[model samples]
Target: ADFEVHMLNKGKDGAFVFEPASLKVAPGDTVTFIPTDKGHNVETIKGMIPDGAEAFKSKINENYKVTFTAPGVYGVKCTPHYGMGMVGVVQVGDAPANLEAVKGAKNPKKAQERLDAALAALGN
Candidate 1:
């Protein structure tokens, strides 16, 4: 399956949020990050991806897509707006094997709050 995640400066939830901040997909699914607004880039957070899953990042103001083959949790953020709570989470497969690892990774206070919410939505 394929999914789309939008990068917005201000959205229904508030400023700097990814629409559908929490996501779930089967292994080998593709997710495309669309920059609805400028100055946003998608990147995987350290310690937030499954073991052996390659880390990725996109250039600012550009669209990016990733294929998730590992079955686990993936935390992604917009580099420029991350401090303002621009974050999202992806759960590949039914079992999130790296949930604990994602929980242990730290972020700015605001980003952490958003991350928590996204993870909660995934039932982590």
Candidate 2:
């Protein structure tokens, strides 16, 4: 299946957020990141993706799409607003193989808070 994640300047929670910050999808699913507001780009956080999964980044305001082929947790963030808590998590398959690594990856204060929330929402 295909999923849509939105990048927004302001959302119900606060500024610089991704709607549905936590998501679960099958191994072969694809996710599309839409920049509902400008100046946002989605990128994979280092050490947060499953082994063998390619790291990716999108140009600012560009629509980005990624296919999930590995069964693990993928951490994502908006480059510019990452410190402002613009972070999200994508879980592939029923069991994520890289959950520990994803939790261990360091992030900015606000980003960490949001990321933790997302992870918790996944019941991990």
Candidate 3:
């Protein structure tokens, strides 16, 4: 599947806040963040960024790509835009536990940590 986020131009370029704000994805999916305007770049939130963090935010005036190998929630903030209210999030996995799993997660990149937590909760 494909994902797209645009910056709203309200006396400026790009959206003030991500249109959808949040998205859902399954395992092994590719996410592409494209800026349809100038002076907009995806950046990681200081505390809410992804585990890897490197792929969380992107530079403006360019195309950004990220592959979701596991399941979790990722928050992306924009530079020069977040201050203007430009931000969004993606939640992978359809399981109800995914919400809690991601919200309480220490590392979105650690598939094993999530798996182990789930298993342990079941008394396994």
Candidate 4:
């Protein structure tokens, strides 16, 4: 199936960040990250890519859409505001083939925190 992930502000009516934070999809499914706000871009975390997966990044507010070809977990983040707890996860399947690699990747405190939040939401 396909899904739309909106980027906005939280704590009110806005999205502040990824709405679901953690999502589960099939190998052939696609996820579209729509920027309802500016200054946000989606990039595949280096160590967080699934096995045999291709990494991609979108320009700031470019509305990126990814077609997950691998069945694993993918960690995504916003470079400019990774410190502001802007991060999300896409679970292409039930298994996290590269999750440990992603978790072990060195990142800033806030970026790690955001990724942690996404993991927690995923019940990992």
Candidate achieving higher TM-score, 1 or 4: 1
Please give the ranking of all candidate structures by lDDT, highest first, separated by commas. 2, 1, 4, 3
The clash tally of candidate 2 reads 0
Better of 3 and 4 by TM-score: 4
Off-target runs (Cα >4 Å) in candidate 3 are 10-15, 49-55, 96-124
C-alpha TM-scores of all predictions: 0.96, 0.96, 0.62, 0.87
lDDT string for model 3 (1-124, tens) is 6666665444232335554556676767776777666777776545543344345556677677777765555556667755455656666565533444445534333322333333344332
Residue 9, candidate 2: alpha-carbon lDDT = 93
Better of 1 and 3 by lDDT: 1
The alpha-carbon deviation from the true structure for residue 87 of candidate 1, after best TM-score superposition, in angstroms, is 0.5
Better of 1 and 3 by TM-score: 1
lDDT by residue (8-83, candidate 1, tens digit) is 9898769998988999999999999999989899999878999889999999988888999999999999988888
Lowest-scoring 10 consecutive residues by lDDT in candidate 3? Answer: 107-116
Return the clash pairs for model 1, or none.
none
Model 3: how far is 120 from its true place, Å? 28
Candidate 4 lDDT score at position 1: 84
Q: Where does candidate 2 stray beyond 4 Å?
A: none
Model 2 score (lDDT): 0.92
- Residue 18 deviation, candidate 4, in Å? 1.7
TM-score of 3: 0.62
Each prediction's Cα RMSD? 0.8, 0.8, 9.5, 2.3
C-alpha RMSD of candidate 2: 0.8
